[PDB]
């Protein structure tokens, strides 16, 4: 590069990666790398696991998407062979099973927990689509025409935030660049071209709403995060959709993501452009529980471990994925361990050489993550047992 600092930075990345590759047998129990035709902006493991009898591997599936320059975009279902002859002329195959025609890049794709065949998608346009992949062929049509099972109206702009209610069937939330949060009941009688209008529109934010998340236990409770630096807590039982139950001045920059703790009904996390992950207690949102510092750039995704209550991970533009352990907060460290980071930082994943777009914890196999980057790479990996043990 033209700048010395720029040329060094590009070289350090390439050099760090070569070291990461050579050190993978020390840090991981599993590393699987796959280069997708196009980069995916989304990643989410489907909940099902198919164990073939007398086979040394199980088949896991994952929802992916495409992001292309000028080609036909697709919603993808990929199969992954994980441990429960394998030589290619690398160890476990990653394959695209379903390709469903999509209009524009898939900003986010999430399955409905009550019917995992149903997947809502965020488009680069105002509509939010719904697809039943069993109501579509495995091979897409060269017609290139996107035929969603439902078109959800209410937004004026594209977005990323998307969350299905785990306790209330068909209740879908969506966040948009238009500053709104839309709610739909996909069970409502559609109209026109399978078009369902927003049941409610929440207008509390005064900037781009980056994410939405339903509380995992209270079916009426959800949280939102925006570029206005706020975290907002909403109750659908209230009739005022312009004022949230709580407004939290969460960060010193844009708030890009949030995730509720799957084991503690009061604990929640937010990720920000201020390069920190904040911990929140719904019982006292005026005071921040803790700040996770060590990310070297804007954070875009936060996800709690589906298996361990004290574990969460964050990813962003710094091309790294950090895994944090709440139980290690305020622990004593030797001066040598202290220089590597805070005790709460359990692991740094340096497998990606580009911005991490999304990641997903495998719900059936503990410590397995799938992360997708802007350079088309998708990694299925698992840190070494010794990292989280002893």
């Amino acid at each position: 590069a033209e700048s010395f600092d720029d040329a060094v930075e590009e070289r350090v990345i390439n050099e760090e990666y070569k070291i990461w590759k050579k050190n993978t047998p020390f840090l991981y129990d599993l590393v699987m790398t796959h280069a997708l035709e196009w980069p995916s902006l989304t990643a989410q493991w489907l909940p099902d696991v198919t164990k073939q009898d007398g086979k040394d591997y199980s088949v896991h599936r994952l929802i992916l998407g495409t992001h292309t320059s000028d080609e036909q975009n697709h919603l993808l279902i990929a199969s992954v062979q994980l441990p429960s002859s394998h030589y290619d002329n690398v160890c476990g195959k990653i394959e695209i099973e379903i390709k469903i025609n999509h209009e524009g890049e898939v900003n986010r794709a999430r399955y409905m927990p009550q019917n995992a065949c149903v997947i809502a998608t965020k488009t680069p346009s105002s509509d939010v689509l719904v697809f039943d992949y069993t109501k579509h062929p495995s091979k897409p049509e060269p017609s290139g025409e996107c035929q969603p099972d439902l078109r959800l109206r209410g937004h004026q702009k594209e977005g990323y935030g998307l969350s299905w209610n785990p306790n209330l069937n068909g209740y879908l939330l969506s966040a948009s660049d238009d500053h709104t949060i839309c709610l739909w009941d996909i069970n409502a009688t559609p109209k026109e071209h399978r078009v369902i209008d927003a049941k409610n529109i929440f207008t509390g934010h005064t900037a781009v709403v980056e994410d939405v998340a339903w509380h995992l236990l209270h079916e009426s409770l959800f949280g939102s995060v925006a570029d206005d630096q706020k975290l907002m807590i909403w109750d659908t039982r209230n009739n005022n959709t312009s004022k949230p139950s709580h407004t939290v001045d969460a960060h010193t920059a844009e708030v890009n993501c949030l995730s509720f703790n799957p084991y503690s009904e009061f604990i929640l996390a937010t990720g920000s452009a201020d390069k920190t992950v904040a911990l929140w207690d719904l019982r006292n949102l005026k005071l921040k529980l803790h700040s996770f510092e060590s990310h070297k750039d804007e954070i875009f995704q936060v996800q709690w471990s589906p298996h361990n209550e004290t574990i969460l991970a964050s990813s962003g533009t710094d091309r790294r994925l950090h895994v944090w352990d709440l139980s290690k907060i305020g622990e004593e460290q030797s001066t040598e361990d202290a220089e590597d980071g805070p005790p709460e930082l359990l692991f740094i994943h340096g497998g990606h050489t580009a911005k991490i777009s999304d990641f997903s914890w495998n719900p059936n196999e503990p410590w397995i993550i799938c992360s997708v980057s802007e350079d088309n790479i998708m990694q299925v990996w698992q840190m070494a047992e010794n990292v989280y043990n002893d």
Binding site: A35, W38, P39, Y160, V208, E210, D227
Partner: peptide, 15 residues
Amino acid sequence: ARTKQTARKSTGGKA
């Protein structure tokens, strides 16, 4: 807000 990169096609390797 996030800026989407100008996506590159893979031939079975990075971008």
